[PDB]
Design a protein around this ligand. Structure first.
Ligand SMILES: NS(=O)(=O)c1ccc(C(=O)N2CCC(O)(c3ccccc3)CC2)cc1
Ligand SMILES: [Zn+2]
Length: 258
């Protein structure tokens, strides 16, 4: 599978039937339909500054992996009943400002979306094991808009050149994912799924209301990445996102009042 004309999202159902399930992600968030839920506890992202291991171009996105041996980088609160350990973060982006995010809000897309993937290491032995259970994952999504340069983001965008080709990785020590979070912790939450095959419906989604912004120059470093390997016809990594999927009666909760 991929994001091309022949193996893109519109065809994934041909290989993974769960693509047509009842709790698929992403979704179009209709702010007015979101249910304000004051019962939800405060969302807390407790991240350490040196838990990052490497940065990798895996052919589908650029991903930063973390040491998840313990609870030094976890997400807790909000709709979560316990702590989920951060395994990795990656991005989805487009070829222009009007497209790139997976989730959309009132029909609006952002040029990119950051996904911080956490797993329930309290009740599952492996990240892979958790990826298959309904309460296995918790992914925090952050929208990226283009505008002013993002200082901390430079550490990451400067590192992209060395992983521009599919299958290449580099050491990426002491990068604090907290540096990519907005000043607000308000969010929307709903039960969903992985947005890439196997598309298992094991994710509790937490989409932050406030986007962070990076410069167009910074965004351009992402579009410079390649879907292809070094010895192949260069195909730039762009539009690596899955479009919104049917809500199917699911309830979208919000931690704030629109
Ligand atoms: N965009 S997303 O939904 O936030 C997301 C979440 C996890 C992953 C992930 O960790 N991947 C993809 C799924 C994966 O390939 C897999 C394979 C088989 C079983 C379970 C997971 C493991 C690696 C990728 C994207
Ligand atoms: Zn993702």
């Amino acid at each position: 599978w991929g994001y091309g004309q022949d193996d893109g999202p519109s065809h994934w159902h041909k290989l993974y039937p769960i693509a047509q399930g009842d709790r698929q992600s992403p979704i179009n968030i209709i702010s007015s339909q979101a249910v304000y839920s004051p019962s939800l506890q405060p969302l807390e992202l407790s991240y350490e500054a040196c838990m990052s291991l490497s940065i990798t171009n895996n052919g589908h996105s650029v991903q930063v992996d973390f040491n998840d041996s313990d609870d030094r980088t976890v997400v807790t609160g909000g709709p979560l009943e316990g702590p989920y350990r951060l395994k990795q973060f990656h991005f989805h982006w487009g070829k222009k400002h009007d497209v790139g995010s997976e989730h959309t809000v009132d029909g609006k897309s952002f040029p990119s979306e950051l996904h911080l993937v956490h797993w329930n290491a309290k009740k599952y032995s492996t990240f892979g094991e958790a990826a298959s259970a309904p309460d296995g994952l918790a992914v925090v999504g952050v929208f990226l808009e283009t505008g002013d340069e993002h200082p901390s983001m430079n550490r990451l965008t400067d590192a992209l050149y060395m992983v521009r080709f599919k299958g290449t990785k580099a050491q990426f020590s002491c990068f604090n994912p907290k540096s990519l979070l907005p000043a607000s912790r308000h969010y929307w939450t709903y039960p969903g799924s992985l947005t890439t095959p196997p598309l298992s419906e094991s994710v509790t989604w937490i989409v932050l209301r406030e986007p962070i912004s990076i410069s167009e120059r910074q965004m351009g470093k992402f579009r410079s990445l390649l879907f292809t390997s070094e010895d192949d016809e260069r195909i730039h990594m762009v539009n690596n996102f899955r479009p919104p999927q049917p809500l199917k009666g699911r309830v979208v909760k919000a931690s704030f009042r629109a």
